[PDB]
């Protein structure tokens, strides 16, 4: 399971080139070798986010959150997942929805990044 790490990193590197189906496939190899690890699933959510499939992205976030809780993952990661859902809504200019999910994120593990992003969502909401 230095194997799973290697699959994950090939996945990440591909994702970063916008080589999305390749990333997905390696994330899948990763999950197979190591299915208690939510990380692969949230990364997949990143992929769909960038492909611009916001619905599928939220679904994988939700799945990643389930997996993480079930397997007692870092709260931080659960928070990232929630914040990613928030981001998908932000992309869609559904700011009440974005903010709600940032709040969920913040309730799991408060991070400045998410706070700031939430507050800019608040501003957009407020100023029209």
């Amino acid at each position: 399971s230095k194997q799973a790490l290697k699959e994950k990193e090939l996945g990440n590197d591909a994702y970063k080139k916008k080589d999305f189906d390749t990333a997905l496939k390696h994330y899948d190899k990763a999950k197979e070798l190591d299915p208690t690890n939510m990380t692969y699933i949230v990364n997949q959510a990143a992929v769909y986010f960038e492909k611009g499939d916001y619905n599928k992205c939220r679904e994988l976030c939700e799945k990643a959150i389930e997996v993480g809780r079930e397997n007692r993952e870092d709260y931080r990661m659960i928070a990232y997942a929630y914040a990613r859902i928030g981001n998908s809504y932000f992309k869609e200019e559904k700011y009440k929805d974005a903010i709600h999910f940032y709040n969920k994120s913040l309730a799991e593990h408060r991070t400045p990044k998410v706070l700031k992003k939430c507050q800019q969502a608040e501003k957009i909401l407020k100023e029209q």
Binding site: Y15, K16, T39, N43, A46, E50, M77
Partner: peptide
Amino acid sequence: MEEVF
């Protein structure tokens, strides 16, 4: 892009 971990 969204961060991957």
